Amino acid sequence: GAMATRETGIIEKLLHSYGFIQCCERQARLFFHFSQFSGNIDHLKIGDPVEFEMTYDRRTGKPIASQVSKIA
């Protein structure tokens, strides 16, 4: 099928619990919480490339990045 609209970006900055992503096919720098990341966070760092869906946070209407994974 075709429904989940995923796009790509680079890790711009990381904190202990969340990070920020420069979007490749979108002029935007999105927030994301480690809840949305899959597997080994312990070795993820600035510059790693990632795929994700831009959503808006259900709680706080903020633009965010959801269901984030790496491809590296």
Binding site: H33, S35, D57, R58, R59
Partner: protein
């Protein structure tokens, strides 16, 4: 004694930025964290704030405890040593006498342990009790002792069967 504080009754919408700022007026801060649901991020309504110095830690209580922030009166207390011994200490007490007061709970529950928080629920439209309360002891066995000691008994005044369970959730 220690430098770690617990802050209670935070408004939902309070954030780390905002809390930090408020407390940074007292002195320098090592760590400051609002507790939230990992998956949705909603605030559990409490936070830990660790001051650099025992001075500032203590002062913060003196000053900030009780201040109002968006119709919520904060409670800045010392963070006790956490772990397994603190779990299961919140009691849902019911069938108290309607005429119950605050001092009366210190009497009824004081000897079984030191109390952290207590609230007598009132029907605010009346302002007078529903005959229901909460009592949170320090350590687990204090609560457990009080459960067995008071469950199904008549109070030292009223004439009805108490119910003292652990609080749900």
């Amino acid at each position: 004694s220690n430098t770690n504080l617990i802050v209670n009754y935070l408004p939902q919408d309070m954030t780390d930025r905002e809390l930090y700022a408020l407390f940074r007026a007292i002195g320098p801060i090592n760590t400051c964290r609002i507790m939230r649901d990992y998956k949705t991020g909603y605030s559990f309504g409490y936070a830990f704030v660790d001051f650099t110095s025992e001075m500032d830690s203590q002062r913060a209580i003196k000053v900030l405890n009780g201040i109002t922030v968006r119709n919520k009166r904060l409670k800045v207390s010392y963070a006790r040593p956490g772990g397994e011994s603190i779990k299961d200490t919140n009691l849902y007490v019911t069938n108290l006498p309607r005429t119950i007061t605050d001092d009366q709970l210190d009497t009824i529950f004081g000897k079984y342990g030191s109390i952290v928080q207590k609230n007598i629920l009132r029907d605010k439209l009346t302002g007078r009790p529903r005959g229901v309360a909460f009592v949170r002891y320090n350590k687990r066995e204090e609560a457990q002792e009080a459960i067995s000691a008071l469950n199904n008994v008549i109070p030292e005044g009223g004439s009805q069967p108490l119910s003292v369970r652990l609080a749900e959730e």
